[model samples]
Target: MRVIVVIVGPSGAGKTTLDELARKAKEEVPDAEIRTVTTKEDAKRVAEEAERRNADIVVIVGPSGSGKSTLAKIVKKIIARAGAKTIEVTTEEELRKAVAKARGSWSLEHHHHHH
Candidate 1:
C-alpha cells in the first residue's frame, strides 16, 4: 500500500516549498519511512497503512498557485470521481498549529529531565 499526503494552497501559500520540506524530512529519516499525505483519509489511514506495509512514512507533492482553493475542490472531485478518498487540509493559521503538532522539535538535553 502506498501512502500520500497532498499539499494544497494558494499560489503564494508555499505548497511546493512545504512539499520539498516534507520530502527532505522523509529523506533524512529513512527509517521513519515518511510518505506525503494527500487526503483526509490519509491522515486517518496513512500512518496505519505505513505500519502495516512496514513503511516508515509517505509524502505528496504539488505546486503552489492562487487556485489552491479551487484546485482543492477539483482535486477532491477527481479523487471522488476515481472512487478514492480526498482530504483537504488548507494552509492557514490553523494549519500552522497542525504542522507544529505534527512536527515535533527536540533540544539538547538540558541536564535536567533526562539527566
Candidate 2:
C-alpha cells in the first residue's frame, strides 16, 4: 500500500508535524517517501504527481481557508479519482498510524529489495 498524505492549511498548520511523522514512518518503513509543498507552484507540481499516483505522500501547506486549502482539496480529489485513498491527519499519532497502514504488511526489507 502506498500512502500519499497531502496537508493543506495555514502557514504553521502541521507541516512540521508531518516532518515528525516522516521520521517515525521511516523508523518503521524506510521506503516511505514524504513530500512537502510550501509554494503554489510546487503545490501544482505535487498535485499533478499525486494525480499520477507516483508519490507515496504529498503534503501541501499554506494559510488557513486560503487558496492552499483549495489546492489540497483538488489534490485529494485527484487521488480519489485514481481509486486511491486519502487521509487527513491532525496529530502525530494519527499520522504515524496512517503511514503504517499505508505500508500495510510489507516489510521494510522487502520494500528495499524491490529497488
Candidate 3:
C-alpha cells in the first residue's frame, strides 16, 4: 500500500488554487498521485473514496478558515485512531520531507521508497 495524500483546499479552489496546489505537491513528492476537493459535497464524496479504500493525508491549503481544514482535522484523528498513520499539513515543505521525516519514526511497519 502507498500513501494516499489527499490535499484539502478552500471553498473556491478552482483552477487557480488547484493548479498551484498541483505544482506544490508535484515539486516535492518527487513523484506521486493527486486529487482536489474544492466543494464540500465534492469533499464529502471523495472523503468516501478515502474512507472506503486506503490510508490518507491532508494539506490544508485554505488557512482561510476551518471549512475543509476542520473536517480534515477530524478525519485525521478518525483515521489515525482507525489504525493507519494520518498526517495533516499546510505547506509544501510539510507535504513531503517533513511529513516523511515524521513517518520515519513509525516506518518500521512497511516498505515504500527513499529519494
Q: Report the number of clashing residue pairs per model.
A: 24, 3, 0
Judge candidate 2 against the unseen true structure and give its global Cα lDDT, from 0 to 1. 0.51
Candidate 1, residue 70: Cα displacement in angstroms equals: 0.8
Please, what is the TM-score per model?
0.35, 0.48, 0.60
What's the candidate order when arranged by decreasing TM-score? Answer: 3, 2, 1
Better of 1 and 2 by lDDT: 2
Give one digit per residue, the lDDT tens place, for model 2 in 2-115: 545444434554657657644554565555455565445545666677667665543322233445465556665565565454444434545566455455533432366557
Clashes of 1: 24
lDDT of 2 at 101: 47
- Give the C-alpha miss distance for residue 60 in model 1, angstroms: 8.3
lDDT per residue for candidate 3 within 20-114, as digits (tens), equals 77677667663335556565555555455566666434333333345546656654555565566665655544445555743464365444556
- What does candidate 1's lDDT look like per residue over 1-115, in tens digits? 2334444323443457656756764564333444443444543354454445532112323333443344445544444444333344344445434333222311121223754
Measured by TM-score, the strongest candidate is 3
Whole-model Cα lDDT of every candidate shown, in order: 0.40, 0.51, 0.54
